[PDB]
Ligand binder design. Structure first.
Ligand code: HEM
Ligand code: HEM
Ligand SMILES: CCN(C)CCN1CCCc2cc(NC(=N)c3cccs3)ccc21
Ligand SMILES: CCN(C)CCN1CCCc2cc(NC(=N)c3cccs3)ccc21
Ligand SMILES: C[C@H](O)[C@H](O)[C@H]1CNc2nc(N)[nH]c(=O)c2N1
Ligand SMILES: C[C@H](O)[C@H](O)[C@H]1CNc2nc(N)[nH]c(=O)c2N1
Ligand SMILES: [Zn+2]
Lengths: 419, 421
């Protein structure tokens, strides 16, 4: 049936028909909701479940059909020939190759279908870099440097994705071992504490084990660890002139710069899997720009990340002896003012959570009008601070899984057998 | 379904194992292909009247509850258990319904709270004062019971959780109902120029009261009268004695001008429009009360755009740059309002809990329920507070949501279904 979602602030009701198109499971049942589970088995893509000639043609036919519907040429001569072309290819090689137009369409729609992404108003503005001719980690490094340079654009960030060769037998995977192209190292200290980003302690140790000489500072850009065609991964240093960073300062608190905080301008996720028409692209780094709260709330103030609230609140001379003084909430706002101010002062693209969630509501309205719906995961869409003063808090959302999609996959060091 | 389901806390790495979901009794709204986790009222969280429960539907619902009760008192399979089952079955046969024992009523009410997946306050669930008002026959009698509840629960600011339970639904034409959404709430008045005075959330109910004969003072914080329906009769208006309504004027520890905003709020949140379901019986009037978490007032009541909507005025008094959203002037004022709310309640010695303490307690409660009960149903969308979400521990806590009985359920507004005499 048609499903209605209401905004409880504006009373707008939208009617969802698009969910009728989905075939992937969510993890919920009629009797249990798993809406807050970060990784049900239905959002991940193991190298176990790579398809076969059997399973592959229906998935391919589904995608070709939706592509030719999207260009208003359903059933055309070009459509019929492409289905026959793809069928013969799967039959004689156990796989098939996307056309360039199909690859671009599939990457844009994987973003459009990402129910956890608040930035999807931009979905049709995506630069797609076809790297399917790559064969070595040196080639991967070259493609990644070009991506970083293009997407950074001297601070005027541009969304981009680079797509490396698809999975074949699961023993010749292309993988970026980094979770993002640009990230900071973390180091376990003798006294038991952590230097740098605690989230990256394990990956940092693998780089050190592979020969990386760590500077052992608080914000050391990690090297790239690149695996091509299932071989052992190889280390590379991104040229530093390509790595745009912002020193964080505060418009009012002159002492804030003395905290020594910085962050990088370019968020570039490199560990997800792109699925298009049954094909699995296990290396597909994609980049956009930051929403301020990603840095100011989560990276800086998560207890398991840089965890700076206590230091900031002390410089603010807040009463920290009782929770009900809301000293953490006060420091949190000031930290997020500093992040936005610093990026804006340096002319590095960033969006605040008020502007981003407002754009997302507009996007939802666009999608319901032209597409009949928009899958959206409230748990991820609502920002991690000031939730109910953003309009998405009051927006009912339906979450469902459409393909093409981005999926999580296992960390390669848990599956890879080395030299 | 699998026997064991695991939830992870992504901050602490603690993994918990849920087996209680196997006892889930009714639907969530989700399917295998869609998640409705952010829908506020899926039809499965509601209860419509006229249909009532039939004889055949009622026995298994009653047996399931009676079994659960005798299991909890470590008397499962006992002589008393089997005799109670026989007594209930015979009542349902001769009268099409049955009456709960006092002990069963208390157990059922406490467990409806324990099972309320959207409540962050459930560490308190076993400390609930249950007032049995099933002997009530008139709206005047309902008023008396409600006044006693308010006085007991308020306790001069040392608030005590309580519930008052009126007679259960029979044929659906004799329902007891409190037409108010909460026992204490402020009126809202639509003005000819489109503005609203008082609380915009309550305009519809305010107009009903005025139509029923309430003379409104037409101020910003007017306590609404009680509109009470006994035995399916037309509802009747009563004024709550003002000495029973504890209120807190809102001031700020630093900003001396904050008191000049003229804000106040009431101390006792007392939901009065939900339905309590125990063993297939439906208690359509069951007002229950606890105490506030501060964000309920400081974030939602005061700062929702469709409520009192005070962010702009507060931000002006703070001399904030209000031209760009990226100055975060809304976020800065929001914190200061919530500091004021907690400071004022604590200064007046009226029970309140901040969102840091409440969520920390809920995590401890959840862990204990997993260890001793096999699980704890929780709705993340409602449990995470409406400000500073990720600096509270519940943001990082995976949760499983499922529906256990006894339960609290929403029900349609009575003015939409009531047959006027
Ligand atoms: C253009 C600016 C963009 C902004 C401002 C933005 C914003 C965000 C934010 C804030 C999140 C939550 C991240 C977190 O909590 O860790 C997110 C998630 C996500 N973004 Fe976007 N995004 C943008 C572009 C893109 C692009 C270009 C892609 C891919 C082509 C993309 C794909 C995704 C996916 C797949 C997720 C969720 C991953 C999951 O399912 O768990 N985003 N986005
Ligand atoms: C003792 C202190 C208590 C605290 C601090 C507390 C806290 C809360 C909060 C903050 C909410 C969300 C309210 C909203 O956003 O509008 C809530 C919901 C709820 N509370 Fe509690 N509560 C307490 C006691 C109780 C009691 C005594 C009962 C019933 C006996 C109860 C039953 C419920 C239910 C059923 C809901 C969710 C309604 C729904 O399903 O939508 N609470 N609670
Ligand atoms: C701690 C991070 N967790 C593990 C999620 C990692 N991830 C998954 C994919 C979506 C995602 C988005 C961001 N941010 C962004 N604005 C963007 C990155 C790329 C395009 S936009 C940052 C991280 C992630
Ligand atoms: C705008 C109000 N919305 C519509 C929800 C009303 N409601 C539903 C039931 C749970 C609930 C809890 C609170 N607060 C509390 N601490 C309590 C009230 C009673 C015991 S604890 C306030 C309101 C509600
Ligand atoms: C347990 C819960 O699912 C988890 O902490 C989620 C909550 N919402 C989130 N939302 C976003 N955008 N990013 C996250 O990492 C998370 N974490
Ligand atoms: C659309 C969304 O479900 C709605 O705004 C919810 C979000 N979470 C909430 N959480 C609580 N505690 N109370 C609420 O009223 C809401 N509203
Ligand atoms: Zn669900």
């Amino acid at each position: 049936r048609f499903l209605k979602v209401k905004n409880w602030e504006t009373e707008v009701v939208l009617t969802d028909t698009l969910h009728l198109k989905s075939t992937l499971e969510t993890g919920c049942t009629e009797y249990i909701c798993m809406g807050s589970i970060m990784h049900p088995s239905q959002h991940a893509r193991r190298p176990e479940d790579v398809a076969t000639k059997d399973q592959l043609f229906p998935l391919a036919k589904e995608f070709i059909d939706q592509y030719y519907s999207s260009i208003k040429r359903f059933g055309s001569k070009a459509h019929m020939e492409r289905l026959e072309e793809v069928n013969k290819e799967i039959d004689t090689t156990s796989t098939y190759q996307l056309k360039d137009t199909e690859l671009i369409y599939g990457a844009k729609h994987a973003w459009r279908n990402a129910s956890r992404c608040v930035g999807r108003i931009q979905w049709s503005k995506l630069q797609v870099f076809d790297a399917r001719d790559c064969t070595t980690a040196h080639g991967m490094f070259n493609y990644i440097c070009n991506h970083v340079k293009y997407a950074t654009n001297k601070g005027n960030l541009r969304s981009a994705i680079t797509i490396f060769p698809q999975r074949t037998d699961g023993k010749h995977d292309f993988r970026v071992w980094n979770s993002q192209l640009i990230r900071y190292a973390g180091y376990k200290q003798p006294d038991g504490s952590t230097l740098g980003d605690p989230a990256n302690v394990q990956f940092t140790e693998i780089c050190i084990q592979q020969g990386w000489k760590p500077p052992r500072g608080r914000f050391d850009v990690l090297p790239l660890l690149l695996q091509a065609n299932g071989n052992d991964p190889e280390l590379f240093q991104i040229p530093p002139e390509l790595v745009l960073e912002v020193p964080i300062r505060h418009p009012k608190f002159e002492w804030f710069k003395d905290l020594g905080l910085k962050w990088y301008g370019l968020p570039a996720v490199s560990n997800m899997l792109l699925e298009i028409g049954g094909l699995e692209f296990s290396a597909c780094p994609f980049s956009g720009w930051y929403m301020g709260t990603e840095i100011g709330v989560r990276d800086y103030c998560d207890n398991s990340r840089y965890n700076i609230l206590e230091e900031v609140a002390k410089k603010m001379n807040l009463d920290m002896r009782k929770t009900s003084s809301l000293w953490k909430d006060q420091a949190l706002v000031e930290i997020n003012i500093a992040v936005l101010y610093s990026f804006q002062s340096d002319k590095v693209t960033i969006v605040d959570h008020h502007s981003a969630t407002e754009s997302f509501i507009k996007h939802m309205e666009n999608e319901y009008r032209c597409r009949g719906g928009c899958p959206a995961d409230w748990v991820w869409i609502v920002p991690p601070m000031s939730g109910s003063i953003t309009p998405v808090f009051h927006q009912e959302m339906l979450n469902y899984r459409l393909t093409p999609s981005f999926e999580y996959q296992p960390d390669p060091w848990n599956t890879h057998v080395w030299k």
